Every structure is written in structure tokens, then in C-alpha cells.
Symmetry: C4
């Protein structure tokens, strides 16, 4: 909460140097009134390494290499050493790609940093171009504006051609910044293409898998009604949970977090068991992790009155109805929370009523063999179960 | 069926505003005859929020901010507030990316929306450029056509340079729209690249996997004839089912849909069992989900007369022949639907005839151990089986 | 072998129409000597549908819509209907993306087709531009060359600007072909980007996985020597089999092809068993599919004299040495083909000699429990084994 | 160490030929003083095939096809055969993509090679353009600089248009190099886009999976506190091990390397067992590979005093505390290396103390059933265990 201000200030002073140094390098008339803010900015920059404490850009930028050759006059070719502290931008970018890189998309952050670098380099190239120019009597503002317009035209690969170089040195400068502008335009194109490509992931993956399964059944000469049912089920899955499988997403979590997730999910179902009031937490903790989720569409047969039957079902989201053997006299209707199929684990007996799903159910299924496997090691719970069984 | 007309009308009125508002902003001579259609369009726009009932663009666009400053004359710099309702395009795009985004490729929809935005922005920029221009005596049509040609030339990064800015404000406008045009050209390039990259998926994945396996066997000093056989098998798989594995595509479906798919597939094979007429549906439902699909090429040995043999085979698509032990006297020829290998489950006896595949078979195999496991729990079916066994 | 000539001829006649029709549309002086070749080409085109026998481009292109309005003079605006047969290119591309799409990369084929379409469209646009031009006394060759140069300059987004439109219709044509050229340049950029991205797959996947594992061990404070050993092993794997796992590539094949591959691999090892001369093919066929491949680096301990030991090893590629318990008196040296570790399955006895690997071995391991499981069902082979055991 | 100099020399001589041959082809005044270095370079090139010993570029480049037609004067159209040895660049690239392709990213190497080819082709095209030019009295340096500037302007799709072709042959040359420049700019764009897209992999994959799981729990109406806990756990995993699962990264290694990794990891834990001083290496080697890693967050319940308990835990990185049943009297605090939970394998007894994690633990868990399975086959270790059990 107290270092964010420092990081913002160091970014601001680096950006101010980037704007200022070439502008006062081309113009000797400047830097006369800009003494105190520059002095305090230089103090802020040199007061960076002790707070930070690889180190090379910081070492090469922290020393007051400026403020001497602005009045200590030297020829132009050796005067280019005033841009050594411009390497502060690299450290600023390396710090910004770690302090806030997770709030936004890293590709977006890289693109924004590249755009800022483009603007700074365009300003620097415009300053250099207007420096490397025959002298004339004209206002400074128009002279800088023309240079900026020309460097924007060159860097964007548009090439209006209204103004063209004349002397060979201008032509060489144009060639080198033409290669530079082409390279940076390529970088921007690549960044935008990558960001666009890595934008739609789930909506394309679900479409690809539904297309694959639709083509596969279309080969198998399947009936159109079943095709419509499967397409509707996939559309429902995409609309509900964005086409993510249950057990394929509840696997990255470790054991305790998965157990906590299951407990929070079934905290409204575990205490509504008529055959077990909750006399024991270890048994509930063991049985809660072995629930197998299944999805039943509208009109699907969950349990048929007449089959053997060995599985119990816990209703989680949808609503289900219970019908008779002849499917003409409805017995009862169930909803979320309350479960059914309890007369399948206490003895090996056939089912009694046919259960038909009205809408999408999102119910969880517990089998028989795993239940027996994880109940056989608890004798007290077993006694409490077969005392109520008969 | 009654809201699609409303959505089309709101898209039409938004597009009409986008075309109209800058054109009548630059031209004070217009808007004189265009009273009633504008009034009804404004009523249609303001009658959007009650039908809809985040809300910010709708609130900022629904109010009749226009129709007052068209005759209530104000200076140009503050007159730009007539484009507030142009934010309706964002809501239109957000509604279109949900009402019909699944009929076509989402990347294609995004590209088309971007192209429409490009055209609208080009028209707006042309109107602004012809507004920011020294006055002259010329027809309005040619003056607008020149501006549109110039903004198309700038936005496409071509830069003919026949017409160039003169005043500094024209140069600043050119610079800002040059950055804008470069950005949107980058967006279009990225969208096209992503759409092209995400076009060929199966034809490239199958090619990659066949190249991988071909290189792997080429390392292992494998015989060329087996290489040709495997290449032909992979080509057949790609031609038939687009190179999709059976069990790797019949796994996204849940249990009931998979059971229905299996039932629909084997609805012509389950009733053609000579050893079981169908006295029981639970047994058929249990055995239908455990069938293991295999593919046999031309000339492959399915069953050899002399081996032990424990598996039964159901023919699904291809045709197979039955040969004798000496492979000189053909016994019978089989086709789809009818199965063989039934004298392998009722007792532990060696095979009798050698079965050779003529063409690609696409037959399904059922093993012995799983069959015994899922038959041991049905005593009546077991009695009905070993009564016919001997 | 007889339809390839027909496909080449239909491609040639379509390309000839594409070159010819606009050129003789702009030039009324042509088509005078080009009667017979055009007549036979039209006969070849109209003789396409009976050989082929969706059908719409073929129907719209097969009829002799040309050869009437070349001398049956009509005004220019309605004369554009002579390009209806240019839709033959779509059918040609759809046929070419199936007749030879698997010899080369599909992305490369799409790029080449797009380049051909670019050239044809550039020629057509040049013809249209030189048609829409004020009349002048100049040679036809130079007039066509200037138009082609201009349309290449426009389509490549270069924009020299030496020649510019003057009349409004020329400006409209320039605008529409500018949008067209931008769109096709975007398509070419996207195709090239996709082809480059989908070029290096294995060399990048292996690099990514080795970087992942190197970083993971670098976190775990692992010794540098083990890091060097693992890096060398990964480099050896990439150099040898392009970084493809054995069991992860021998799984796409079905059961019979995998069995044939295993038989061809071990056709030099299965007959060199001193404890079993080969009295039975079913046992060999059963044991050949359960071999587990492992890789041992230089200096790794395969078997230590003193451990319990339950696995047998078959040498496939590398060479291994056998040392004594004290690792000072070498017993024997082995190479590919010949196996060792046979005194581990016939009784539960401890190992006798320490086996150390010299170079990379690529040997296959067979365990004890699976061997017993697949031998217990063969009593004769069991008797033949324990008769030689003692 | 002695062939790298030779490869550098062959690259240098090929690059020197690439720079030199067109420059002395356009200028007949050159090549007069450049006899001896050219002679030794030709000897070095012709002395390449014997050291190397497909061969076609080497054969076509090794022979001294130059040095004859530089003074043996022939007309220009047939003089283009002096560029046959320029195919040496293809062999140089093919050698460079194998000698050092693994030190850097292969995409980066391809991009750098393409950039070098761009520079060489630009120089060659500039030489050709200044050759195909009307004669004039001007310095050679300015004449070459203008040509280089023009070819850079053309190849970068900028098109200043200050200088334009006049004769038809210049226009044809401009057209062909315009297509060439567009193609190579597309190649550069594609390479940059691929390199950018294949740059951020782990930081994007972890973000995608955490977004997927966050959305999935957001659907399930999960409590915000558990969401915060899971988000913090995922952030910790990314900060610590870059979001790589343990068992999903310790699977590419084969059996011996994995065993060595486990031994090096537990070389500080295996010798700190109070119940077993280390009387046997086979038992330790067997039990070390079956450890199951788990991650426990701050405040998670590892062991509760009152549960049954069957697993032992080895602390690896984090620190854990031990509390009493009532969680008011702390018993002891543990750290890395030292383990706990030992009173769970020697008999079936309930736990005694509740263990709560303070910070992230990174501890490893060993279960009961696998321990019994891999201990039952060692009778001496079993006797040594149950002698200390009681
Ligand atoms: C991330 C951001 C990165 C930004 C990177 C930017 C990269 C490019 C920017 C360069 C800044 C400007 C460089 C200007 C270099 C030239 C130096 C300059 O300011 O221009 C004049 C020279 O004119 C000249 O003909 C100099 C001719 C040579 C110019 C070379 C320019 C190279 C660039 C000054 O001398 P003037 O005449 O007053 O007499 C001095 C006499 O009194 C000695 O005491
Ligand atoms: C590399 C550039 C140099 C390449 C070598 C070519 C070179 O040096 O050319 C010279 C120009 O040098 C010069 O100072 C040219 C002026 C300086 C050019 C500076 C180029 C680097 C700019 C980097 C910006 C990065 C921005 C990142 C943000 C002049 O040659 P020329 O005999 O024809 O002149 C005759 C003339 O003096 C009248 O007789
Ligand atoms: C998704 C689609 C997004 C589209 C986004 C489009 C973005 C760009 C479009 C802008 C629309 C046109 C803006 C035009 C702004 C200028 C306003 C204008 O219409 O031009 C004239 C001003 O001329 C001028 O020199 C104005 C000079 C300043 C122009 C500033 C232009 C900024 C753009 C009108 O005044 P006129 O002379 O009649 O006297 C009025 C006097 O009588 C006050 O009563
Ligand atoms: C940001 C643009 C402004 C950047 C700041 C630069 C700036 O303001 O420059 C001024 C132009 O302003 C102006 O109104 C320039 C005219 C208005 C420019 C409007 C730019 C935004 C357009 C957005 C379109 C989005 C389309 C989306 C679809 C003039 O400076 P200068 O002292 O040289 O003039 C001297 C002259 O008055 C004669 O002495
Ligand atoms: C995959 C490949 C796709 C290729 C697609 C190509 C797309 C573009 C190519 C178009 C082909 C050329 C179209 C030329 C259309 C114009 C027709 C033309 O040939 O030009 C002259 C008209 O000049 C004119 O001013 C015509 C003015 C309107 C031109 C409209 C051009 C639209 C394009 C001919 O009339 P002319 O004067 O002899 O008097 C005739 C009198 O005697 C009536 O009997
Ligand atoms: C769409 C293009 C038309 C857009 C609508 C604009 C439009 O029609 O403009 C007209 C040009 O039409 C015209 O024939 C323009 C000539 C025909 C343009 C043909 C464009 C389609 C070319 C497709 C090539 C695909 C290649 C694929 C390979 C002339 O308007 P304007 O009142 O200023 O004239 C005044 C003048 O007559 C002197 O007073
Ligand atoms: C990876 C790198 C790849 C690089 C690939 C580069 C590809 C392009 C480069 C070409 C090199 C230069 C080619 C120059 C070809 C022309 C040959 C040349 O040097 O130019 C003059 C011809 O002028 C002419 O009008 C020649 C006219 C035709 C030019 C054709 C140029 C094609 C290119 C020389 O004859 P000059 O007058 O002295 O009389 C000779 C008389 O005395 C016969 O004895
Ligand atoms: N009257 C009823 N009220 C509520 N649920 C019932 C009723 N009758 C049957 N069921 C449920 O329907 C199921 C059908 O047979 P089960 O043995 O699975 O257990 C049964 C109960 O779960
Ligand atoms: N005459 C026949 N007609 C049809 N099928 C046969 C005939 N003889 C053998 N078969 C099939 O060939 C198989 C070879 O041995 P099986 O025990 O697998 O069972 C046999 C039958 O499926
Ligand atoms: N003299 C020998 N020649 C060849 N191989 C041997 C010799 N002595 C031992 N071996 C091999 O070394 C192995 C060590 O113990 P095994 O029981 O695995 O079986 C042994 C043989 O495979
Ligand atoms: N006084 C103690 N000092 C260190 N560890 C203990 C102490 N008491 C209990 N523990 C640990 O806490 C565990 C709780 O029950 P366990 O049977 O898992 O084995 C116990 C020991 O690992």
C-alpha cells in the first residue's frame, strides 16, 4: 500500500525522461528553466537502488550522467551518451510484468507495453529526424509536428510521400527507421493475432466436440430423433456449466479442497437421510467422495419398476417424478435435496416404482459395490443399518 | 418469432443513426425534410428499455438528446455530444453475439461485426475530414466521395498520397486516424489469421498422428509391407469416420444417452441370437454396453482353427468369410448383422473353423471374463444358457 | 490413370477462360482468329456433366453463354454476363482439394490456390481498369502493362501513387478494389501465419516438456549431476525416436496391427529362448503383447546381485554387460537379440550376478505376476516349464 | 572444437560471395584488385565436399564457375550464371538448423535466418535495379544508395513513390519484386506471430484452468470463503512450482530415473525412521516409489483425534503443528524432514492427537493397503516391524 506510490513515481520519472531528453537534446534553448524538477527527479532515480536492495540497467541509469553535458558543451557525435538512462524502461517493464500481470491478460499487458514503447520510440525518432535537418526559420511547434507526422507515416507502413529525404544521411536514417518500423509493425500484428486467437476457447472447444460427435453418429446411420436429443443435451450443458465435465474439473484440486467442496455441496442433503440421522462423521466423509454424477434428459428412464436395481440416487438440481408400474397412477413428485431409491442397499430386492425424469435432473448416483466396500470396515454403522433394515 | 423483428428493427435504426448523424452534423442544409422518420425512430429507440426490462449505454442512448441541437444552434466544439447514442452499436453487438452466435462460427461473426464497424468508422471519419476542410464551391457528392476515398486509402495502409493535409489541424487529424487505421488493420489481420488457423483441425490432427506413427515404425526397422498395410488402414479410417476413435468419442455422452446409442446401434443384432430369443431385457441391457469394437483389415486372421478361443464377435458393417482348418474348403460366408463365434462361451472348447476377413469388418468383440462376470448375477439366464449348451 | 488427364484438361480450359474472357471483353478487335480452339474448349466444358454423373456452378458454366455476344453486339452494362462460367474455378478448387490434397500439406495447397486466385483476380482487375479509362492513342501492350502494374501496386498495399484516378467512377473502382486487395492481403497473411505456426510441432513439444521437467526439478533442489543425466537422456530420446513415447504411440493401432508389429519386432528374439524351443504359438502370442519397454542410461543398475528379483529382460537395441557381486570380475558381455535374467520365473530365488548397462539399452521387461497369470491357463506349457526348471 | 571454426569460415565465405558477386557483376571496374582473397575463398569452397564426405547444391557451388567470366567477356543475358554458387546459403541454413538449433528457440533461429536472407536479397535486388538503369554521370556510392533505399521502400510495403519506373522493363522488374516483397513480408509477419503465440504457455494454461474451475464453482453456488481459499491455493501453486502437478510431471521419466529422483528427494527422510534404522535396502526402494503427494492449505485438518486413521505422513517442505483432542494444549511442533502419524500401520488403532497445518505443507502420504501389499512379501522386515510394534 506504500510501495505502489513509489512504483508509480518511478514509472512517471522514467516516462518524463523519455519525453524530455531527446527534446532538450535537439533544442539547446531548453533546460534553462527546468532545473529543480529535473534535480528532484534525478534524486528520486538515484534513490532507487538502496530501496530495491540484473542490476546493470539500474547501475547505468542511476548515476547523474546528465546535468553535466547540457552546459558543458561537447560535439554532437559524442553527445548521444545522454540516453543511457533510457534503459530504465526495460526495468520498468520487468517490474510491471510482475506487480500487476495477473489482474489482466498477460498478452494484453504485453500489447499495451509495446504500444507505449511505440509512442516513445516515435517521439524519439521524430526528434532525431528534426535534429538531422537543414536549418531554417520556422516555429519549433510546426517543425516538431511535421517530424512526428512523418515518423508516424513511416512507422505505420503507409508512406504518403509528401515529404522525402534529400541528403544521403537523411536517406540512411529513413532506411534504418524503415526497417525498425516494419519490425515493430510485425510485432504489433503478431501480438494482436495471438490475443485474438487465445480469446475464444470454451465456445470453440465445445463446438468442436459437438461437431465431432454429431459427425460420428451421422456416420453410424443413427435416428434423427436421438441426434436432436443429444444436440439439445449438449446445448443445455453449454448453457448451464459452459460445457465442462464434472469429474474432469474436480480433479485439479487436492484431496482436502475436494473434500471441502463435496461437503459444501451436500451440506443440504447429508442431514436429510431418514435411514441415518447422522450418528457418525467418518462414514459420511467416506461416502460423500464416492458419489458419481450423471445427467438425465427429459423423458429418460432412471429406474424401471421390474428391474433388479442396486443404486441409490441423490437429487441435486433438477426435479423428478415417480410413476407406478403401469405409468398411469402417479405416486409422488420430488425436487432438489430430497433423494429416492433407498430400498436398494439394505437388501437385494427388485424395484417397486418406475421413476421418470421431467426436466434435466443433475442428480448424483451411488452404486452398491463401493457402498458395501466402504461400509464393511465400519461395524457399528453396519449394525445401525441392518437394525433399521428389518 | 415475434422478437426477431424487433431486434432487426433496432439494428436497422442504430445503423441508420450511424449513417445519418455525422452526415447531417457536417451538413446544416439537411434534416429539414427528415422529421417524421427520425421522430418515429427516436420513439422506437426510447421504447427499448421497457421491453428489455449493463444499462448504461441504453440509458445514454435512449433519451432524445438529438432533435434539439439541430435547430437550437450552438458552436461546433460542444456540438460533438450528438454522437452519444452511437454507443447503441455496442449493445447491438452484445445482443447479436448471443441471439445467433451458434448458427455460424463465432470467429466469423466477430470478423463480420468488425468489418461493419470498419465501414461505419470509415464513413464517420470521412464526414469529419470533409467537415475539417477549407470552404470551397464544389458539389457535395464529389466532396464526400473524395473524403471517403482518402479515408479508405489511409485506413488500408496504402497511402497513394495524391491529396495531403496542409494545415496543422489536418495533420493532427491524419496522425490520429493513422494510428486508428493501423490498429484496426491489425485487428482484421489477427481475426483472419485466427479464423484460418482454426479451420482445418481433423485433417491436420490425423495427418500429424499418422506421420508420428510412420516415423516411429521407420525408426524400428519395420518391414515396408506392414508400413503399407498400416498406411492403408489409416487412410480407410480417415475416409470412413474422419479418423475418430470409437471409445474416445463415445465417452462425452452420459450413461443414458450412451445406452440409447448402443441400443439403436444393436437394434438389428440383439434379436438375431439363436441361443437366446430375448427372454429378458436386463441381460441384454447389461451385455450391450460391454462390447469392445475392433477393426480388422483385409486378409487378417480373426480366429484360427486350432487356437483356444474365448471371445464372440458381432459383425456390424463389413463382410467376413469362414474357412476350414486347411483353408481350402470354404464353409460359409457372412455379412453384417449375423454374428459368429458362439461356440466359445457355453463351454471351454477349442475353435473349429478358421475365420478370415475379406474387407474391412468394423466388427465388435465380446470377451469371456466380463460375460461371465455380468452373467453370474443372473441365475435364470444362466440356467437358460446351460440348458441349451448341452 | 485415365481421369487425371481429364482433370488437367478441365483445369487448363478453366484457366484459359479466366485469362481470355476479360481480355477479349475489353478488346473488341480480338476473338476474330480464336474461333476453333474456343469451340473445342466449349465442347470440352459442356462434355463435363455427363462424365461427372452442388451442380449449380456446373450448370451455370456448361452452357455456351459465350460465342453469341461477341458478334451479337449489346451495350457494355449488360455485357458483364460473359463471366458466369468463371465460377468453374470454385468447382476446380473443390475437386483439387480432394484429388491430391493428401500428397502435400492442406495449408500449403490452400495457400497455392489462393495465390493462383490472386493472380487471376489481378489480371481481371487490370483488364477492368484499362477498360474504364479515357480513350487514347497508345499501344495495347503498354496500356495493359500499366494497368497490371497499378493493380499489383494497389493489391499489395504499397501505393506508389505515380498514377491516380481522376474521374469519380475511377475513384469508386479504386475504393472497391482497395477493400478487395486489403481483404486478400489479410487472407494471405493469415494463411502464411497458420502454415508457419503449424510447421514445428515435435521439436517444440519436446522442448516444452523438457523445460517443464527441468524447472520442476530445479524447484526441488535436485543435484546438478542428476539434472545433467536427465538432460542427456532427453537429448538421446529426441535424437533417436524424436521424443515419442513407446506405449503412447503404440495405442492408435488396433489389436491385430499391434500384434503384427510386436511379432515383426520380436521375430529375432522369440526363437532364441533356451528354456523353450517354441512348442506352441498361442503362448508366444500371449506373452509378446505384455512386454513393458524401459530405457536404461549409461551406468544404471538393472539387476543387483543380492536383491530378490522377479523380472526377465529382453535386449532389443543396446548392449549390456554382466558383472559379479563384487564388480571386479566380469562374467560375460551381451548384445541385442540375446536376453538375460531367465533365472527369475521358474522359482522364487535371489539374483546371482549384478547387471550394469554400458550404453543406452532400449531393453524390454517382462514381470512375474502377469507371466504367471497368462501361463496358469496353459497347463502343457506349465509342465514343459517346470520339467526344465529342475 | 575444431569444426566450429570451419563452419564459421564457410558461413563467412558464403556471405562474402552473396555481398560481392552482384556488386562486381554490375560493376566491371571491380574485381581487379580482389584476386588473392577470392582465390583462397574459392579454394576453401572447393575443399568442402571432401571434408563433408543432398549433394546437389554443394556440387553446383563447389566448382570454380566464377573467375572465368569476369575477364572472359560475354553478353549480359547469359552472364547471370555467376549466381549458381549462391545456393550455398541453403546448405548453410540446413547445417545451422542442426549444429546450434537447440541453444535457442527454433522459431527465433528461423526468424533470424529469414532476416539475413531478407538483407541479402535486398542487396541483390538493389544491385539488379541499379544495373537495369539508363547510364548517367554520378558517383557509384549515391547510385547504390538510391537503389538500396528504393528496394527497402518496396520490400517493406511503404511505397514513398519519390522515384518511379519509366521504361517497361523497369516496370516489370518492379512488379516481380513487388510480389516478392509482399511474399517475404508475409513470411516475416507469420514468423513473428508464431513466435509471439508460442511464448506464454504456462502462465496462460494456469490462468485458463483456474478460470475454468472458478466458473464451475461459481455455477455450483459455492461459498465465497472457499472460493478465496481455492484461489489462494492456486496462486501459491503457481508462485511455487509454476502450476505443474507432481504426478503429471514425474511420468515422462522412465523407471530408473524416477527411482533416482525419489531417492535423491528422500535421502534426508529415509534415514530418520525411529521404527526402522534401515536394515534392508530393497524394502526402502519398494516403499519410496509409492508415496502419494498431497498439498494442505493453512488451517486444514490433516488428522483429527477421534477418527480411525490408517495413513502415515512424511513432511517434506512445510511446517505443521500437533494439537490435542480439545485443541487447547499444544503437544509439539514439527518441521521438514521429521515425519508423524507412525502409530497407524503397526496395529489397527484410532488416532490420538489432532494435527493441524499452519502454512502450506507439501507433505507426502503413504496409505495402509499398499504398505501391507508391499510388506507381505518381505517376512524378515515384517518380523522386525511387529517385534517393535509390541
Ligand atoms: C525508448 C526510446 C528510445 C529513443 C531512441 C531515440 C533514437 C534517436 C533519437 C535521437 C535523439 C536526437 C539525436 C540528435 C543527434 C544530433 C545532435 C543534435 O542535437 O543535433 C544538432 C547537430 O546537428 C547535426 O547536424 C547532427 C548530425 C548528425 C546527427 C546524427 C543523428 C543520429 C540519430 C546539435 O548540434 P548543433 O548543430 O547545435 O551544434 C553543436 C555544437 O555547438 C557542438 O557544441
Ligand atoms: C547504421 C547507419 C550507418 C550505416 C553506414 C552508412 C553510413 O555511415 O553512411 C553515412 C551516414 O552516416 C550517418 O552518420 C547517418 C546519420 C546517423 C544515422 C543513425 C542511424 C541509427 C539510428 C538508430 C535509431 C534507433 C531508434 C530506436 C527507438 C554517410 O554515407 P555517404 O558517404 O553516403 O555520405 C556522404 C556525405 O557525407 C556527403 O558526402
Ligand atoms: C462507430 C462510428 C463512430 C463514428 C465516430 C466519428 C468520429 C469523427 C466524426 C465526426 C463527425 C463530424 C465532426 C465535425 C466537427 C465540426 C462541426 C461541423 O459540423 O463542422 C463545421 C465546423 O467547421 C470547423 O472548422 C470545425 C473545426 C473543428 C473540427 C473538429 C473535428 C473533430 C473530429 C460546422 O460549423 P460551421 O462552420 O457550420 O459554423 C457553425 C456556427 O454557425 C455555430 O453555430
Ligand atoms: C488528440 C488530438 C489533439 C492532440 C493535441 C494537439 C492539438 O491540440 O493540436 C491542435 C489541434 O487540435 C484540434 O482541435 C485538432 C482537430 C480535432 C482532432 C480530433 C482528433 C480526435 C478524432 C477521433 C476520431 C475517432 C474516430 C473513431 C471511429 C492545434 O495545434 P497547433 O498549435 O499546431 O495549431 C495551431 C493552429 O491553430 C494555427 O496556429
Ligand atoms: C476469378 C477471376 C474474377 C475476375 C473478375 C473481374 C472483375 C472485373 C473485370 C471486368 C472485365 C472488364 C469489364 C469491362 C466493362 C466495360 C465493358 C468494356 O469492355 O469496356 C468498354 C466500355 O467502356 C466503358 O466506358 C464502360 C464504362 C463502365 C465500366 C464498368 C466496369 C465495371 C467493372 C466496351 O464498350 P465500347 O466503349 O467498346 O462500346 C460498346 C458499344 O459499341 C456497345 O455495343
Ligand atoms: C458498388 C459500386 C457502386 C457504388 C455506388 C456508387 C456509384 O454508383 O457511383 C457511380 C459509379 O458507378 C459505376 O458504374 C462505377 C463503375 C463500376 C464499378 C464496379 C465495382 C465492382 C467491381 C467488382 C470487381 C470484383 C473483382 C473480383 C475479382 C457514380 O457516382 P457519381 O454520381 O459520383 O458519378 C457522377 C458521374 O456520372 C459524372 O457526373
Ligand atoms: C540470396 C541472394 C539472391 C540474390 C539474387 C539477386 C537477383 C537479382 C540480382 C541480379 C544481379 C545483377 C543482374 C544484372 C543483369 C545485367 C548485367 C549487368 O551487369 O548489367 C549491364 C547490362 O545492362 C543492361 O541493360 C542489362 C539489361 C537486362 C538486365 C536484366 C536484369 C535481370 C535481373 C552489364 O552489361 P554492360 O552494359 O556493361 O555491357 C556488357 C557488354 O560489354 C557485353 O560484354
Ligand atoms: N409413495 C412413495 N413416496 C415417495 N417415494 C416413493 C414412493 N413409492 C416409491 N418411491 C420411490 O420409488 C423407488 C422405486 O423403488 P426403490 O426400491 O428404488 O425405492 C423407491 C422409492 O425411492
Ligand atoms: N457351417 C457353418 N456355418 C456357419 N458358421 C460356421 C460353420 N462352421 C463354423 N462356423 C463358425 O466358425 C466358428 C469357428 O469356431 P467357433 O467355436 O468360434 O464357432 C464357429 C462358428 O461361429
Ligand atoms: N556366466 C554367465 N553367462 C551369461 N549370463 C550370465 C552368467 N551368469 C549370470 N548371468 C546372467 O546374470 C543374471 C543374474 O541373475 P539372474 O537370476 O537374473 O540370471 C542371470 C543371467 O541372466
Ligand atoms: N508428544 C508427541 N510428540 C510428537 N508427536 C506426537 C506426540 N503425540 C502425538 N504425536 C503425533 O500425533 C499423531 C496422532 O496420532 P497418530 O497415531 O497418527 O500418531 C501421532 C504422532 O505422530
Amino acid at each position: 500500500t506504500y510501495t505502489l506510490v513509489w512504483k508509480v513515481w518511478i514509472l512517471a520519472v522514467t516516462l518524463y525522461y523519455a519525453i524530455r531528453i531527446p527534446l532538450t537534446l535537439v533544442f539547446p534553448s531548453l533546460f534553462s528553466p527546468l532545473l529543480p524538477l529535473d534535480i528532484l527527479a534525478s534524486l528520486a532515480l538515484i534513490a532507487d537502488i538502496p530501496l530495491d536492495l540484473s542490476r546493470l540497467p539500474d547501475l547505468l541509469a542511476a548515476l547523474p550522467l546528465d546535468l553535466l553535458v547540457f552546459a558543458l558543451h561537447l560535439p554532437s557525435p559524442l553527445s548521444l551518451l545522454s540516453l543511457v538512462r533510457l534503459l530504465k524502461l526495460i526495468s520498468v517493464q520487468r517490474s510491471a510484468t510482475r506487480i500487476l500481470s495477473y489482474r489482466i491478460n498477460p498478452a494484453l499487458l504485453r500489447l499495451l507495453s509495446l504500444v507505449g514503447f511505440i509512442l516513445l520510440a516515435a517521439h524519439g525518432i521524430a526528434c532525431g529526424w528534426m535534429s538531422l535537418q537543414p536549418p531554417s526559420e520556422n516555429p519549433a511547434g510546426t517543425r516538431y509536428l511535421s517530424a512526428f507526422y512523418w515518423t508516424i507515416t513511416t512507422l505505420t507502413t503507409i508512406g504518403y510521400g509528401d515529404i522525402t529525404p534529400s541528403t544521403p544521411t537523411q536517406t540512411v536514417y529513413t532506411i534504418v527507421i524503415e526497417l525498425l518500423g516494419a519490425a515493430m509493425y510485425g510485432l504489433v500484428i503478431g501480438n494482436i493475432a495471438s490475443l485474438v486467437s487465445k480469446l475464444d476457447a470454451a465456445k470453440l472447444l465445445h463446438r468442436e466436440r459437438v461437431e465431432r460427435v454429431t459427425a460420428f453418429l451421422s456416420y453410424k446411420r443413427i435416428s434423427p430423433e436421438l441426434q436432436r436429443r443429444i444436440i439439445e443435451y449438449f446445448d443445455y450443458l453449454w448453457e448451464t456449466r459452459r460445457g465442462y465435465e464434472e469429474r474432469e474439473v474436480l480433479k485439479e484440486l487436492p484431496h482436502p479442497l475436494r473434500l471441502a467442496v463435496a461437503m459444501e455441496i451436500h451440506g443440504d442433503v447429508i442431514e436429510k437421510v431418514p435411514l441415518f440421522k447422522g450418528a457418525g462423521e467418518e462414514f459420511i466423509r467416506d461416502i460423500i467422495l464416492h458419489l458419481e454424477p450423471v445427467i438425465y434428459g427429459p423423458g429418460e428412464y432412471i429406474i424401471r419398476a421390474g428391474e433388479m436395481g442396486s443404486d441409490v440416487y441423490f437429487i441435486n438440481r433438477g426435479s423428478v417424478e415417480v410413476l407406478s408400474a403401469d405409468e398411469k397412477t402417479r405416486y409422488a413428485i420430488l425436487s432438489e435435496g430430497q433423494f429416492f431409491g433407498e430400498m436398494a442397499l439394505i437388501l437385494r430386492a427388485p424395484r417397486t416404482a418406475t421413476v421418470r425424469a421431467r426436466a434435466f435432473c443433475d442428480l448424483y448416483r451411488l452404486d452398491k459395490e463401493t457402498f458395501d466396500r466402504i461400509l464393511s470396515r465400519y461395524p457399528e454403522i453396519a449394525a445401525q443399518i441392518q437394525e433399521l433394515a428389518v
